[PDB]
Amino acid sequence: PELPGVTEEALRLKEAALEELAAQEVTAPLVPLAVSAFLTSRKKAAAAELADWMQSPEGQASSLESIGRSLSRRNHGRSRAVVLAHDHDEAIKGLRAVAAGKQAPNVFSVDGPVTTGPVWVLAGFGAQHRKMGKSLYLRNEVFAAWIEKVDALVQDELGYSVLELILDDAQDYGIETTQVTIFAIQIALGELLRHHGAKPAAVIGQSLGEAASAYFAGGLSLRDATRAICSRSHLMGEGEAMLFGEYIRLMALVEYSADEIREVFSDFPDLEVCVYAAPTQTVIGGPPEQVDAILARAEAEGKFARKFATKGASHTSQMDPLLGELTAELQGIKPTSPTCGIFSTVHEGRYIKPGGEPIHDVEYWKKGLRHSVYFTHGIRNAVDSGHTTFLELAPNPVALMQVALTTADAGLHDAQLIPTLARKQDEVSSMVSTMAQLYVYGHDLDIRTLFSRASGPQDYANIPP
């Protein structure tokens, strides 16, 4: 079934953006330098020895890329470290610290691997920004291909190009396109990780993210997961556009826990819980006058509270009139038995095991849009079941700050909280550094794939063996 190609306008926009990229001053890439051994004591030795070599003229004459390439081909032992560096000075200072077992922002170092697989966090609320995904789309052939694949599916489903949005700095995102585009980007980022050998042990979803979570847990084909986010997204945009003024439901974050909310809500009979986000943070929704009132009641009581700006009212009665069209649109999707674990924040945070019964039903998407997102509960259930590595696939890492609030509450004070892209951070670097972290903690990640195949020998270094 012939899928639409990249649009004319997208090609035009790409050309322009490449032209402009080609004119910025090239910045030195971030190179990851892996050092490992069966023993931490020996890992530090190799570190200090590599550093000593990099000090010498031969080592100063070798590119960081070559040193990283050689390093990446050593046997990767139980105890691991990666110094992420842009030049020789950075590299040496990082290695000094690995050797001294001292800490630094560009160094990661552990005595041994994390016991349980990573949980991939698929969220999206509040993570959008204007240029999101663009730079990685221009710079990374594997990302770009997956973006283009979702872009084709959305043209087919919805009639416009998400990739045109990504490329056009003049174009901003609204209720509908914000969602379909964060989705595109979640899909492509996860597949970029798969390409480098990463896998999720489990997923957890948060509202918009739930459809990407289904895909990566093998619960729906890419097509059907695109179908799920497309129906949610366009129906939500259309539904708000037809409502006016104080009939538009708002959302806000307030520093009250589930228990405090049952009390507080007796004053605000139309407020509902959108996302139980953290143990003492809840995104609530309803009529503006009640939202403003709960906001002021919080600010008064000495409690954090921030109103959001989106006339989306996911997880409120404002979704009531879309349920029927939603049900109708997703007739025909095929839920499949998952291939990894799922913490279902739609089902109150409950775990479904690889091999379980399909849970990606039409009724599932109906349930998820209308009802509360049990995010903190899902994350608590992961922590309690031995998971300690949380990786957010996002254009900006807002849900990991929520994850941290739950990990800490549950007694897990040193979780591995791994972000992907971020606004104000080079996207190619970010991915490097995310892959370095995965590698370091022992999770699947073929670190050889972080360097292109050697053509000649100057692509290697004479690293002290």
């Binding site: 971030l30 922002p105 990991l400 700050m401 909280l417 972000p419 970010s430 550094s433 995310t434 972290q437």
Partner: peptide, 9 residues
């Protein structure tokens, strides 16, 4: 404040 290389802070 999550930094340069993936750090909650």
């Amino acid at each position: 404040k999550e930094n340069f290389w993936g750090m909650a802070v």
